[PDB]
């Protein structure tokens, strides 16, 4: 779930993906990438070979196991936009997220299935198409309910 790479110097790094990414769907966080290199010198230039110092190098190969970030337990995080209904005519279909089946009255509160159903005797905004997962799970859910 991580991408490793060398970036230019700075205090704010953006990260983007455009391969199906939303016009290159990107974010931008702050990250004080300042080159605190060893020795008196202050540049990224190996070529006149005089420098032989220790360096804390990032590993360039893939891992075997070093320490586990924990991904599991596919939850949701609060929304309002799961299912469809005109207040006693509810349509619940297959979905891209694990959508709980909620209504304003009756047994519609939950149920993370992608199963088609009509719903009466409930709420027009009261359809709680919930978030969940099955065979999924984020790391810690930082924004992430």
């Amino acid at each position, epitope marked *: 779930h991580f991408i490793l790479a060398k970036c230019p110097p700075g205090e704010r790094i953006s990260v983007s993906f455009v391969d199906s990414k939303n016009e290159h769907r990107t974010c931008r966080i702050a990250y004080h990438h300042e080159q605190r290199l060893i020795g008196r010198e202050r540049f990224t230039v190996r070529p006149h070979h005089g420098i032989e110092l220790p360096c804390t190098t990032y590993q360039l190969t893939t891992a075997e196991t070093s320490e586990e970030i924990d991904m599991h337990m596919p939850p949701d995080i609060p929304d309002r936009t799961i299912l469809s209904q005109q207040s006693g005519n509810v349509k619940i279909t297959v979905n891209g997220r694990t959508v709980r089946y909620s209504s304003s009255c009756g047994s519609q509160a939950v149920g993370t299935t992608t199963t088609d159903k009509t719903i009466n005797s409930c709420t027009v*905004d009261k359809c709680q198409a919930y978030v969940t997962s099955h065979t999924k799970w984020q790391f810690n859910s930082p924004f992430v309910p």
Partner: antibody, heavy 117, light 110 residues
Framework: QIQLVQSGREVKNPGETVKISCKASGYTFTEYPMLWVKQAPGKGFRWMGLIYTNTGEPTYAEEFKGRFVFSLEISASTAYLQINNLTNEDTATYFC??????????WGQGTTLTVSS | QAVVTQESALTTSPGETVTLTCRSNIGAVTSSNCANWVQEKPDHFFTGLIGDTNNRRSGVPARFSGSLIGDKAALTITGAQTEDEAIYFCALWYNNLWVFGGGTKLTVLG
């Protein structure tokens, strides 16, 4: 569903709001939410909006937006599909309906208004 | 979001039925969409003869029933009795309104 009684034949001056009244009782007034009618005869199925308001989503339509604004004391399904900024072109049925059986299954009696300044 | 333009008379005879399909502009009228086709009456008629896109909706007789019919909310008026004249609204759903247009001239003879 929504047992809707409609408003009267309204008489509306120019620029005002003409609430097509609704006694949308017999069921939940949220169970039969604010399904507005703004139906002319040339319109047929005329825009006033739809709402089953059991969760609370009543909307004015394209015909219930601009000139329309859906309001109600909807506890007994008391409703006013208001011709808001209703000019001399305010003659239309501000009509009752309720969202249940996902179109206007429970329906109203209609409130046909003659708008004229 | 389509103004339901369709067969101009989606109506039948006395003992006769007319199965038209009034185009709400995306396709068939739906059930979670709530689009339909049915003879409702005039006079600010909050009553769906056929809504919910598989049969008659709430507030009308079920025989002038909604469908996903043709390219529209289908007004399959089977059971055109003596009182079968109305606005056969064939329109499409959006999950908030079965949007009809000017109405098919719904007829049951008699």
């Amino acid at each position: 569903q929504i047992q809707l009684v409609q408003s009267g034949r309204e008489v509306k001056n120019p620029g005002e709001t003409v609430k097509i009244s609704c006694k949308a009782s017999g069921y939940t007034f949220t169970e039969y939410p604010m399904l507005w009618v703004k139906q002319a005869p040339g319109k047929g199925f005329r825009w006033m909006g739809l709402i089953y308001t059991n969760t609370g989503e009543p909307t004015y339509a394209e015909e219930f937006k601009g000139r329309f604004v859906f309001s109600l004391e909807i506890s007994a399904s008391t409703a006013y599909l208001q011709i808001n900024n209703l000019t001399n072109e305010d003659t239309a049925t501000y009509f009752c309906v309720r969202d249940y059986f996902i179109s206007l299954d429970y329906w109203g009696q209609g409130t046909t208004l003659t708008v004229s300044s | 979001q389509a103004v339901v333009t369709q067969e101009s008379a989606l109506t039948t005879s006395p003992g006769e039925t007319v199965t038209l399909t009034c185009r709400s502009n995306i396709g068939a009228v739906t059930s979670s969409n709530c689009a339909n086709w049915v003879q409702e009456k005039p006079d600010h008629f909050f009553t769906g003869l056929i809504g919910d896109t598989n049969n008659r909706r709430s507030g009308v007789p079920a025989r002038f029933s909604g469908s996903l019919i043709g390219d529209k909310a289908a007004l399959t008026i089977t059971g055109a009795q003596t009182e079968d004249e109305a606005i056969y609204f064939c329109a499409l759903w959006y999950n908030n309104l079965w949007v009809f247009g000017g109405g098919t001239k719904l007829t049951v003879l008699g």
